[PDB]
Structures are given as C-alpha cells and as structure tokens.
C-alpha cells in the first residue's frame, strides 16, 4: 500500500475539491484474527502477532507476525495507528509548512498526510476509524474530518494562484471503509482487516490500562478542532 499511488487517484482541477465520498461493505470471506497475546507493563505494550490464517481472499498479507511494542502513552490511538501504517509516511507536517500563514489559528495543524504531486496537486488526507458498526458512525467520523478541515483549508485556498487542493478522509470500520480516495474493494477489506487486529489488541490493552480508553476519548475530543 503506497501513499503517492492513492494520491494519483483524485484530480482537482482548481480550487478546493472534497471529492466524492464512497462506501466499501465489508463483503470478502473474512479469515479469522492471528493469535494476539498482549502484555501491559510501564514500558508500553507488547503484542505477539501469531500467523494470519490462510483464505482464498488472502487478507492478512500486510500484517507482520511477531513481537512489537508500543509505548504506553501512544497506546490509546492504537486503532488510528496499526490501521493505516502502511499509508502514513509520517513526517507530521503542518499546513503553513505547504499553505500561506494566515494567523487564524489553524496554521498548525497537522493532518495524517500532506503530499504535493509532481503536477502541482496538493492532496491533504485525514486516516480515522470508528468502533460503531452503525454506517452513522461511519458518516460522523467522515463529517468530523471534514468540518475541522474545510474551513482553513478554504480560507487558504482563496489566497493562493491556481490552488488545487484535494481534501481526502478514509474512515475504517470493521464492517465498511467510507472514503473519498477511491480504493480497490481489496484494499479497503485489508483496512478492515488491520482495524480488527488494532481493536482486539487495544481491547486487550485497555482490559489491563482503563486508563487509555480516557486518553483516547480527551484526544479525540481536542482533535475536534485542533
């Protein structure tokens, strides 16, 4: 799963395009999760990724069986972070460092990806997920992503020469992907895949660490707008 392919996948003409949001059902037959032990201990959590199972859909082929920690303080977005690490070439960037300043107070956010193609095109995406198997909350996850970004991004937008801004949110479930990236069903039904696994194993974390589940919700809260 590449970063600069998925990016090649919209076009915006001028100004600023949000595309067009499309819903991917969870349809493949599903191999069951890898075996998951998970420790929690002060250095962070450990998990032992057992192997994927074998199915005619092959799903499981970007999971790395073995041992991997995370620090415990990252712990609570565990979901976010094993579901799209194959797509987060993280540099963490901000917008000033591609957009004018504009002193709005929006100059230092940081989506999951800002990308400029070779044409010109300036594609920012925003990866979430969401525990609601209720496409509402597939649809609040997509709506919140939009709402935080759109304004800046508009306001930056309308103060530049031939801006073409392509706005992407890819929302992960375990049941659908919403997305206006267009995907391969292939791809979107490993984002599912790797959203079960980053569940059952932040599920067992959370079992050990309660503690967590209040970081992730304050985090996301702040993440509304900041």
Do not use: W
């Not at 032990?37 to 970007?62: C, E, M, R």
């Amino acid at each position: 799963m590449n970063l600069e392919v998925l990016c090649g996948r919209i076009n915006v003409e001028n100004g600023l395009s949000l595309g067009e949001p499309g819903l991917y059902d969870q349809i493949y037959d599903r191999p069951g999760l890898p075996d998951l032990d998970v420790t929690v201990d002060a250095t962070g959590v450990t998990v032992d990724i057992g192997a994927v199972p074998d199915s005619a859909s092959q799903l499981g082929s970007s999971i790395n069986a073995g041992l991997i920690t995370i620090q415990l303080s990252e712990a609570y977005k565990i979901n976010h972070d094993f579901t799209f690490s194959g797509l987060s070439k993280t540099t963490d960037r901000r917008l000033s460092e591609v957009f004018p300043i504009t002193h709005d107070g929006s100059d230092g956010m940081t989506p999951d990806v800002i990308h400029t193609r070779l044409d010109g095109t300036i594609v920012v995406v925003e990866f979430s997920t969401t525990r609601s198997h209720n496409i509402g909350g597939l649809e609040a996850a997509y709506r919140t992503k939009i709402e935080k970004y759109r304004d800046p991004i508009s306001r930056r937008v309308d103060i530049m020469e031939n801006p073409r801004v392509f706005f992407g949110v890819i929302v992960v479930s375990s049941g659908g992907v919403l997305s206006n990236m267009p995907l391969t069903q292939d791809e979107a039904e490993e984002l599912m895949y790797r959203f079960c696994i980053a569940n059952e194993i932040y599920t067992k974390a959370r079992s050990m660490d309660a503690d967590i589940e209040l970081q992730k919700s304050e985090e996301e809260l702040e993440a509304i707008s900041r």
